């Protein structure tokens, strides 16, 4: 409602890549945040191949995001809903998705930015931020359903946030290699099966985003995990992250931690700013 922004305040710089509804652009937004003359933004658009239904759904999803104020979830900044084209204006995440970011710190990487792979301190900070954002989503009664490094984003200051590979199935496409065994079985998704996928994200973080279950076909992964298999620990993985993975990969979903529980385990070794920005420490959790 008060989220409307004049189309004329958005300038578009360059393509960021295809999103679910259309091309996402990097841009600038004039006078969109009090105290900032100009804000780097991501700008979501919808293909002209969209049905009227998809255009209406594109805007309805932005409406849902108006209810979200969490430092560790990529936030909506504004909507262009009057006239066409329509634009959903998001916080810019200048280091892109977490999978591409991880692969770029591999020693072999052509786009290596000349810094070493993540430290233990950096990996625990990442884990806490992702879990804090997921805890927020869960309090808002949303099951993510698709947690994976590809759907986590990295900010200019390297904060990780929840953003917004697949086999066909009876209810839609399934991210088989990130799915809990009970989801492979009946196709139900819960915060507990989200906690499974969180463990896979920690595995991607500690493997610099190798492909989970490489060398296994989608059909074999589905049987391996349903039987009780799980990923092997990457070489020289810190014990502390290995212990998180083991919690996440309990076969019984009832024995997995909650996202608030993850942040509690990690809270004492975080950047000093974390209690200032986290959902965990906020009065919305107290």
Swiss-Prot record:
Phenotype upon changing residue 66 to R? Increased cell surface stability
Q: Which residues form the Protein kinase domain?
A: 10-274
Q: Where does ATP bind?
A: 20, 44, 91-97, 150-151, 164
Effect annotated for changing residue 165 to F: Reduced interaction with GRB7
- Residues the record marks as active site: 146 (proton donor/acceptor)
Q: What is the effect of changing residue 22 to V?
A: In IRAN type A
Consequence when changing residue 82 to E: In a subject with non-insulin dependent diabetes mellitus
- The modified positions for Phosphotyrosine read 165-166
| Stretches assigned to the Cytoplasmic side | 1-286
Where is the cross-link described as Glycyl lysine isopeptide (Lys-Gly) (interchain with G-Cter in ubiquitin)?
A: 66
What protein name does the entry list? Insulin receptor subunit beta
Which of the residues bear the PTM S-nitrosocysteine?
70
